[PDB]
Amino acid sequence: ARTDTEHLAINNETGYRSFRAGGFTFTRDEYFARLTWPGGSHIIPIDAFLRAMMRDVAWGFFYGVVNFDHVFGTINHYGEVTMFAGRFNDAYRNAGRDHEERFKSSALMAVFKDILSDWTVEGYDPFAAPMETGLPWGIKNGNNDEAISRQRVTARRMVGLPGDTPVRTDANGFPVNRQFADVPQEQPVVEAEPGFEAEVSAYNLFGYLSRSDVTWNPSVCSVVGDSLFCPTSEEFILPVEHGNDRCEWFLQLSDEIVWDVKDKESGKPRARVTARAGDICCMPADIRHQGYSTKRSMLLVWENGSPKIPQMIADGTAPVVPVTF
């Protein structure tokens, strides 16, 4: 599992640096990310690229396959990470033109962070929805290192408990997003008997989510073993097609999302799932998916973080769908 990455030259005309990781090269210009690897090349528009890179960075390579598009992406091996071109593309695979390299995660993550920093310009937030931010086009113009370096929040047990991740408020820097202006913000009534105040705890979860400053960013709010509730607020398009290496579940908390479901291995369209409030569905382990949300919407993403799952699915000792009827 490789470790060799490199900062290459700043381009005189564009102002941007290029980067190498193993055999892959990364270069951007005024409109595009340009990728090369031994045997071929690919172009992704820079806006989509940076939104995808932002999530793959913020999520630490997430679970399973983070497809940036139909050609390029990463596969999390939890400590190591595969980067690929065409691994999950029928055309490339049939032709034997796919390419994959395997890295130590910290090595690939360090280069991905430098890419994101160098390629993000002033006033552009690749974590935000298009109506909330400026543009990534043109030559290097400053940076937005503040937007791309946000601290991950993860509750150890539950939001708002002593020593755990805190409730969001105006005062700690998290106001209500304009598209949730109407969401009630009152906290639940909590009256603890003397000596139990650490154990009697509740918070306004929809209010917390109305205060999220990023889009498409599942964030642990409550834990029971490996079961993680990871809600998030969603707007525009999930910047990746997620092919999970386990099953996962979506519960729509507000408004509406449509999921485009394709085959995980080939990328062929399989289904479109419309979820309105209250709808819960499963994404099976052999598909990839990408969501669309016109209005900023609240979603619960529910995960089983157990590391045993991917090998069980591979073996067939765990099913691709968790329930059959």
């Binding site: 009630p184 099953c247 399989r270 289904a271 409030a277 819960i280 569905c281």
Partner: protein, 166 residues
């Protein structure tokens, strides 16, 4: 003006799986309000499952019996207003088997322990249900809630009845 659309037992609008080349049953799609609307008060119906872990939907209506659990659980109110009472058990081992998972209906009889507190949840409020506490609910008007838990002696599975088969 901005309108954020939330569901309620009395006002939900189910979506669904549109198929290109698939089986809709693979997505195990239901609407937790519809599920709560149709169950017995405080009946805890599985609406998601991933190995042993579950999400349960239930309608709160009147006063429940007491529950306790060998691990933590969380409840999220989805609609209406729901009162939670917490009791610290003197001997929770007398009610819950240490080797068990999932909530346990531990009876309507008040178990022996000390009052921990009380919580009033409305839509969107999540409370902790801590290992070692017994808890019970009251809701004046019917309300919906979900549980993050583990499949156990209280969990009802009825996937054929709740899910899209299209």
């Amino acid at each position: 003006d901005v309108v954020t659309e939330f569901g309620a037992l009395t006002d939900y609008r189910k979506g669904g799986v549109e198929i290109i080349d698939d089986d809709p049953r693979n997505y195990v799609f239901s609407n937790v309000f519809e599920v709560a609307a149709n169950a017995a008060p405080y009946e805890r119906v599985a609406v998601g499952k991933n190995f042993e872990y579950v999400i349960e939907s239930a309608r709160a209506e009147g006063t429940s019996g007491w529950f306790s659990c060998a691990h933590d659980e969380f409840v999220l109110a989805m609609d209406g207003q729901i009162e939670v009472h917490l009791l610290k058990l003197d001997n929770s081992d007398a009610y819950v088997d240490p080797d068990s998972e999932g909530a346990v209906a531990i009876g309507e009889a008040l178990p022996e322990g000390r009052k921990m507190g009380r919580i009033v949840l409305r839509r969107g409020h999540m409370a902790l249900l801590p290992v070692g506490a017994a808890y019970r609910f009251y809701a004046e008007q019917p309300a919906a809630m979900l549980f993050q838990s583990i499949e156990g002696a209280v969990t009802v599975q009825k996937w054929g009845e709740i899910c899209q088969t299209e």
